[PDB]
């Protein structure tokens, strides 16, 4: 349940530290992004010499949320924070070479299989 103006942590070493959601892509009037949804973000904070710099505008995929995800038996998984992985605007491949913290099987799809391969844990 991410929406515009939401600040997210970055689950990857691309060098951003805080990003703000500025558009929930993939639908007219679409209100919310959940795990595995693409968002347009802008970089609010970055480390001094990462791959990206403050004020850049990029796509990202949501990988953890405080709202959590629902599973087919009705179970729920929740995380203490909201985090995303930064993607290239055109190819939507990841920018970072490594991923931090767990991810969830909702990403287990051919589009993000690289993230699932790098993730420390898949819940």
């Amino acid at each position: 349940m991410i929406q515009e103006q939401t600040m997210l942590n970055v689950a990857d070493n691309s060098g951003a530290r805080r990003v703000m959601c500025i558009k929930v892509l993939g639908g007219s009037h679409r209100r919310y992004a959940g795990v595995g949804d693409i968002i347009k973000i802008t970089i609010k904070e970055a480390i001094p010499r990462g791959k990206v710099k403050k004020g850049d505008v990029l796509k990202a995929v949501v990988v953890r949320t405080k709202k959590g995800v629902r599973r087919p038996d009705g179970s729920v998984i929740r995380f203490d924070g909201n985090a995303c992985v930064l993607l290239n605007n055109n190819s939507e491949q990841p920018i970072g070479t490594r991923i931090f913290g767990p991810v969830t099987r909702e990403l287990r799809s051919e589009k993000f299989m690289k993230i699932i391969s790098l993730a420390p844990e898949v819940l």
């Binding site: 953890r64 959590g68 038996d73 009705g74 179970s75 729920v76 998984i77 929740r78 995380f79 203490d80 924070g81 931090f100 913290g101 767990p102 099987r105 287990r108 420390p120 844990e121 819940l123």
Partner: protein, 114 residues
Amino acid sequence: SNIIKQLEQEQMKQDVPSFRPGDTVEVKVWVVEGSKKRLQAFEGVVIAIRNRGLHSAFTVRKISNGEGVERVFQTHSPVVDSISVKRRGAVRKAKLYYLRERTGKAARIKERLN
């Protein structure tokens, strides 16, 4: 309703162990990656229990790779293969949601030794 409670009794598990909040529990859950099937273990502190018969559920909290995670297990779901109590916690409350606001040495739970 006698009709519904009969329909529920025929599904409940008959071998769920006794555990209570603050106990450290290991839960093994079935996961499927296409043609192959696995158990994976989720281990953490039980912060909540809900006793609604067939609709009973419990919440396990763990820290993994620096990130806090909570998972709500449906106790009688056949996805839950096993439940094991590693350690017994002594706590005064039915719910430990105050542990969300704590970390490290502040989140320690005294043992229910006797």
